[PDB]
Design a protein around this ligand. Sequence first.
Ligand code: 7IQ
Ligand code: NA
Ligand code: NA
Ligand code: NA
Ligand code: NA
Length: 529
Amino acid sequence: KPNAATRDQLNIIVSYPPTKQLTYEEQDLVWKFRYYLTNQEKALTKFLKCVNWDLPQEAKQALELLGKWKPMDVEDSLELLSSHYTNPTVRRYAVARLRQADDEDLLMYLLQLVQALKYENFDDIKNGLEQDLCTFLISRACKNSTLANYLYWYVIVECEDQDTQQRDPKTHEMYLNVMRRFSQALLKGDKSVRVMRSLLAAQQTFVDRLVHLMKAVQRESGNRKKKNERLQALLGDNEKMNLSDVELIPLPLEPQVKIRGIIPETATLFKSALMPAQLFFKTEDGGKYPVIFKHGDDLRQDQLILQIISLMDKLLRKENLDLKLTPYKVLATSTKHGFMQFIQSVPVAEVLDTEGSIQNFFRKYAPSENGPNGISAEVMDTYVKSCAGYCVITYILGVGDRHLDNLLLTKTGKLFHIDFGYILGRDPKPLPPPMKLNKEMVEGMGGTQSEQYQEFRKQCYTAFLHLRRYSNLILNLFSLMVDANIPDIALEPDKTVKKVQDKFRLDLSDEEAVHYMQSLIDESVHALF
Ligand SMILES: C[C@@H]1COCCN1c1cc2n(n1)[C@@H]1CCC[C@@H]1NC2=O
Ligand code: NA
Ligand code: NA
Ligand code: NA
Ligand code: NA
């Protein structure tokens, strides 16, 4: 029906990022050829964006075409749950597509889907005390204990958000109703589901006791040594505090791991202003699981970034690219406390203080006579890959405040980033560079003169092209976060998705994007020396 020139225009429009606004002329064109476009699943979101949903006759025809359209890919349906859509049939269609996702994929989107409840019908959620989003999420949680664990903690954090309670009371009451609905469904279910309900309650009381313990340690006004002694003494009094030995419960941070308590003798406070605790949990497997427990601290921005880093890692692995990344787990248990999975590591700043160079560090703990610069080839391969992964990922996410205390290294060669208080282009100092590499980091692989430097560049190109291909998904997930209580998002909600979108350079072809990434890396490295 449309000629070659029109098809080229339509294909450009269909390729747009999910939050790019269509012009009036593009809306006219998509509508004109709506019947031709029903055979392209990628065109459906563009068509739905061109409908005037406030005109009953047009909404009706649009819903007729929706039923005849080649169904969109499951992950594309996240766009239909954003704030743009109030039409109930559109939003139920999105849930119907999401019902086809497996539990592993749904978990990767769950943080954002909980935010998307803000765009649902609050009366329907309350009156539940065909599937809408609330009903769907609860239904899937009732069948999967991992989903139930994260749904519980994600929602309870929303219930405790005093900002929401003060500034958006109806939204706060909705989340209360979601929790009530969730508890309703769990109690109504069979034995395995009612057991799940009791285990969530047990986790909550454990966290409550841990919070009370942290406060007791901080009413102390002794030095750090005295506070470590207080922390260990309180943890050791199980009759008083009940944290050294408890009946088995899922670890909120990673519920597949059941824990029996916390080891009292090895608990210490970090030497930092907020004095978070390092705690070793006794696992059911008879092992130990170290965490950081932060108290008096909002972990939600870190929680989001580590969730997105975990997604990006899984997407790269899906494309058979394992860049040896460290997406450590982060879970907020309230707006003021939460857990982080502790990875044995050393900050690069400490490596330079004690060994002088990343290379000296690798030569000490991973020597190899015939290896690159006397270092194990496997360790160097792991180093190059992880540098590349984090270079591309922190560039896309605009991570700031990149000093050598936030760059961590393992003896197996993994480099990874921590502490994501500055994202989306924010930085303590002005005019941060678009790509934040460290001189010590290039030096760690042998300098620009090493063959490792070209291996690093090559892995950046590959990772960048792979993540570009999932830009629709990544951008849709940020679009669902724009109203969230996340500091660097709430600063400029209407600009948030574009800040990520621009990093993908979707205006460039693959070959042009590789050229651009090459120039960006080289320019950043050149500026360092
Ligand atoms: C848990 C991860 C991964 O394992 C190594 C340690 N990592 C982190 C993360 C943070 N830190 N260390 C520092 C130390 C105390 C708080 C500060 N802030 C962070 O965000
Ligand atoms: Na009402
Ligand atoms: Na410590
Ligand atoms: Na504390
Ligand atoms: Na890991």
